[PDB]
Write a protein that binds this ligand. Structure first.
Ligand SMILES: [Cu+2]
Length: 123
């Protein structure tokens, strides 16, 4: 299956967001990131992707189709607006083994609050 994600300057949760910012997927699924607004990209955060998944980085303003394989949680960001809270969390499979680690990992205070909200009122 495919899951469409939009990158926007302004969304329900504020400025610089991924909608949806919580993505539940299965191995083999694809996630397509569409920058409806310009000046955005998608990139995996170091140490916040699973076991053997490979890191990735898209081009600014480009549509990017990610194929998810390894089960576990992935924290991704917009390289350009990471500091302002632009993140999305992808959960591949049930009970992702690295979720608690990611939630504890060090990262900007604004992304943390955003991350807390996506796991809470959502899932
Ligand atoms: Cu951005």
């Amino acid at each position: 299956e495919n899951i469409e994600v939009h990158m926007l300057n302004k969304g329900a949760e504020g400025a610089m967001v991924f909608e949806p910012a919580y993505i539940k997927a299965n191995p083999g699924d694809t996630v397509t990131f569409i920058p409806v607004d310009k000046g955005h990209n998608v990139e995996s955060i170091k140490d916040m992707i699973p076991e053997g998944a490979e890191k990735f980085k898209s081009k600014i303003n480009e549509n990017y189709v990610l194929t998810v394989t390894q089960p576990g949680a992935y924290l991704v960001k917009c390289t350009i607006h990471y500091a302002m809270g632009m993140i999305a969390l992808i959960a591949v499979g049930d009970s992702p083994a690295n979720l608690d680690q990611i939630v504890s990992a060090k990262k900007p205070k604004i992304v943390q609050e955003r991350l807390e909200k996506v796991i809470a009122s959502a899932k």
